[PDB]
């Protein structure tokens, strides 16, 4: 109605004021009535439900669906064998700076039988794949740095296994962490969270394959990959199994964030899944 600035601002502010007065009185009166009766408290909280995005996600049949041929695929495209440990190969991209070398040095301690190389000019990926097959490397990891910042990760299982390109967004070193903790030689346990979609179960089996199995129970260390809203979070922690039944933590090594950008069949052959901003605009799918 009113288009004067100072009139309209004043009027709507006073409407807000009267409204918040009434809301305070109403919640206080309901508080008195629920002092009296603890039933209608429960009847309210069962009646109206606080909507959140975690509550409301677009239904996907990939959620809680079993994987067809999961064991043969799991030995096929993934290294899932207690008999055969993985040879992991660190492949830091051409003309790398110092930052990706530091991150590779971090990633040494994470992954088992890990091997680093410095890439040189003029080696195509087929030639590198052939050499790593002859050396029986089963997976290669490519660090993509840019502007002295590690921005991307690439995972390729070598016996014609699938390509994975993750985008690293936010990285924190160990020294910037307040609750620092000192990691040890002991093999940590691992936590995987919210990988329930079929693509999410694929990525979960990927991280389950790449991470070392057989943890050291003596050295109470764990790592963790949480999935939330197509954002996976890497952290790692130490255990205090308390008498008070809540386990105590200390965030030991570095933390960062990953996001799957590209899931491809084979060694960069055909793309199963990609990320697009037009996928992002729907805001309720959450392709995990």
């Amino acid at each position: 109605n009113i288009t004067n600035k100072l009139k309209r601002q004043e009027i709507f502010a006073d409407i807000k004021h009267e409204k918040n007065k009434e809301r305070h009185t109403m919640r206080r009166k309901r508080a008195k009535e629920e002092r009296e009766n603890p039933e209608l408290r429960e009847q309210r909280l069962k009646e109206n439900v606080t909507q959140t995005i975690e509550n409301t996600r677009v239904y996907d049949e990939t959620i809680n669906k079993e994987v067809e041929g999961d064991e043969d695929d799991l030995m096929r495209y993934f290294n899932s064998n207690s008999n055969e440990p993985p040879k992991i190969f660190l492949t830091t991209n051409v003309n790398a700076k110092k930052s990706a070398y530091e991150f590779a040095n971090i990633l040494i301690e994470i992954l088992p039988n890990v091997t680093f190389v410095k890439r040189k000019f003029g080696y195509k990926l087929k030639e590198i794949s052939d050499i790593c097959i002859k050396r029986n490397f089963t997976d290669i990891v490519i660090i993509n740095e840019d502007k002295k910042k590690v921005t991307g990760l690439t995972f390729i299982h070598l016996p014609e296994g699938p390509t994975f390109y993750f985008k690293l967004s936010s990285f924190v070193e160990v020294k910037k962490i307040v609750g620092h903790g000192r990691p040890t030689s002991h093999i940590p346990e691992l936590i995987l969270n919210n990988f329930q979609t079929r693509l999410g179960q694929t990525v979960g089996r990927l991280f389950q394959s790449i991470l070392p199995q057989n943890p050291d129970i003596e050295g109470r260390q764990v790592i963790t990959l949480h999935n939330q809203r197509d954002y996976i979070f890497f952290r790692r922690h130490r255990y205090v199994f308390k008498d008070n039944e809540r386990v105590g933590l200390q965030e030991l090594g570095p933390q960062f964030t990953l996001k799957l950008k590209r899931l491809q069949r084979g060694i960069k052959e055909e793309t199963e899944w990609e990320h697009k901003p037009e996928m992002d605009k729907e805001k309720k799918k959450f392709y995990l």
């Binding site: 041929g69 043969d72 060694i267 960069k268 990609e274």
Partner: protein, 394 residues
């Protein structure tokens, strides 16, 4: 609608009974009537190619080189409908040769190692009661499979071609009476070659080979990786003596639509950059814009006019394209609904589009209206689908 889907990740087939408008992605939408797993044989032996003989039997291609004849029954699902139950009757094994493929693994464009696959599974004859079918490998092995009178598959011949054969298309247009069996094939630096085989199926003769174009804008050699092909009707007008009478079109790897008139000669008279930067292309289907059926059973475009030709292709990414005879993009097909690289597309009966690929989604599209008819989750990577008769239960 009834569908049979080669499901890679299970290594099986799935029978789908669903009506028009079935969408598994939405709970409010129509749900499929019946989902049936069949013939699950592990991921090492998934179904490559299926040939439906009219109802009671189908033909399976293994990854173990085995070709399988399967008896098809119907039994009541216990809205009423029959579901289908499968029983393998005959099998012919040992048709792959990966020795040349691992031999040629150095001169190879792809990064992965090379394994053999049944690229072509179809009859040799346009006339029915053929009982003489062909199985083509990536190794250049062409096998002649006879259905026995005891209803047993028996191989007749196993002839060789050049190395990698990405595709092999038969020519079924005209004069089924004469004993002339024309096919074409090509691959990685393996030119499109027309070969006639003898009707006694003991000898072939390479009758034609294409030739490469001149060097490009950069004066570089154009790389040769044809991916697919269909045939048209031959040249009208006067034949030129001793050239050939064949006209046909093809899709390369490097986003080239290549048209071939044998009356013109071995070089391409027409080669089109469809997409920028030489994007990889995967399959190639031909269609009428109004959903009409203008092709052979092997899909050969029953016309003489290249400008009447309209094609649908896929990349190795999530894209499905339409093009005219000139290379103008008629549109993208279902681009907002797919999320995977469509491994397999097919024009069924002129008016339906079978889609299935890495997206684990079977998509019946309309050809004419370009509208999605049916979306189905299947839980497996898709490489091949046949479509049965339309049923409209309730």
């Amino acid at each position: 609608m009834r569908l049979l889907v080669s499901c890679v990740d299970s290594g099986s087939i799935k029978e789908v009974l669903c009506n028009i408008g079935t969408d598994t992605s939405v709970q409010s939408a129509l749900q499929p009537f019946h989902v049936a797993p069949h013939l699950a044989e592990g991921l090492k032996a998934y179904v490559d190619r299926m040939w439906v003989i009219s109802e009671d039997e189908a033909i399976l291609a293994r990854n173990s080189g085995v070709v399988e004849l399967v008896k098809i029954s119907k039994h009541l699902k216990e809205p009423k409908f029959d579901i289908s139950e499968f029983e393998i009757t005959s099998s012919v094994s040992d048709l792959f040769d990966d020795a040349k493929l691992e031999s040629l693994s150095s001169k190879s464009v792809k990064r992965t190692k090379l394994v053999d696959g049944f690229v072509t599974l179809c009859p040799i004859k346009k006339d029915s009661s053929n009982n003489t079918f062909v199985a083509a490998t990536k190794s250049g092995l062409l096998h002649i499979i006879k259905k026995g009178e005891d209803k047993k598959l028996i191989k007749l011949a196993s002839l060789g071609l050049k190395a990698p054969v990405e595709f092999l298309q038969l020519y079924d247009l005209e004069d089924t009476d004469t004993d002339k069996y024309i096919f074409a094939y090509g691959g990685e630096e393996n030119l499109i070659k027309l070969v006639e085989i003898d009707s006694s199926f003991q000898s072939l003769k390479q009758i034609w080979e294409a030739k490469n174009v001149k060097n490009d804008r950069l004066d570089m050699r154009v790389p040769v990786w044809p991916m697919a092909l269909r045939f048209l009707e031959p040249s009208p007008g006067k034949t030129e003596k001793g050239k050939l009478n064949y006209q046909f079109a093809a899709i390369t790897r490097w986003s080239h639509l290549t048209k071939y008139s044998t009356q013109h000669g071995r070089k391409p008279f027409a080669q089109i950059d469809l997409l920028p930067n030489r994007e990889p292309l995967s399959q190639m289907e031909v269609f009428d814009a109004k959903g009409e059926n203008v092709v052979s059973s092997l899909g050969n475009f029953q016309s003489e006019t290249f400008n009447e030709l309209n094609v649908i292709t896929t990349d190795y990414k999530k894209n499905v394209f339409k093009f005219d005879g000139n290379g103008r993009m008629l549109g993208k097909v279902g681009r907002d609904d797919i999320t995977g690289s469509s491994t397999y597309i097919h024009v069924h009966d002129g008016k339906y589009l079978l889609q299935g690929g890495l997206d684990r989604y079977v998509r019946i599209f309309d050809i004419k209206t370009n509208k999605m008819l049916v979306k189905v989750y299947v839980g497996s990577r898709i490489n091949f689908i046949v479509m049965l008769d339309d049923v409209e239960i309730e």
